């Protein structure tokens, strides 16, 4: 089935911006049916839709299709898009410790 893993990403300080190098989709305030990475099309959780090449997230292990369970202690399963966006962009945290799950593959 699906395996659970944790990814720790050190943000990239570009001038005055902090970059993680990935994109998200999902959230309770969004239509879960438009999600190709979730087995259950009702799942409105947060998912990684993009991972920039040579970015912090890619180097850290983040993979497209990964579902973000929690970020630095905060839960990410029952939040809105903006909420997840804010919890990943808190300027006071140079690092984000992600708890994610991904189709384990290796499941022939």
């Amino acid at each position: 089935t699906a395996v659970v893993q944790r990814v720790e990403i050190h943000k990239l300080r570009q001038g005055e911006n902090l970059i993680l190098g990935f994109s998200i989709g999902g959230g309770i305030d969004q239509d879960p049916s438009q999600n190709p990475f979730s087995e259950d099309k009702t799942d409105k959780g947060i998912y990684v839709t993009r991972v920039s090449e040579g970015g912090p997230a890619e180097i850290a292990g983040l993979q497209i299709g990964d579902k973000i369970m929690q970020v630095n202690g905060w839960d990410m399963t029952m939040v809105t898009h903006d909420q997840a966006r804010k919890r990943l962009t808190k300027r006071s945290e140079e690092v984000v410790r992600l708890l994610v799950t991904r189709q384990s593959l290796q499941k022939a």
Binding site: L20, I24, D31, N35, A84
Partner: peptide
């Protein structure tokens, strides 16, 4: 579907 680049 909305999408945020971070």
């Amino acid at each position: 579907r909305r999408e945020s680049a971070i």
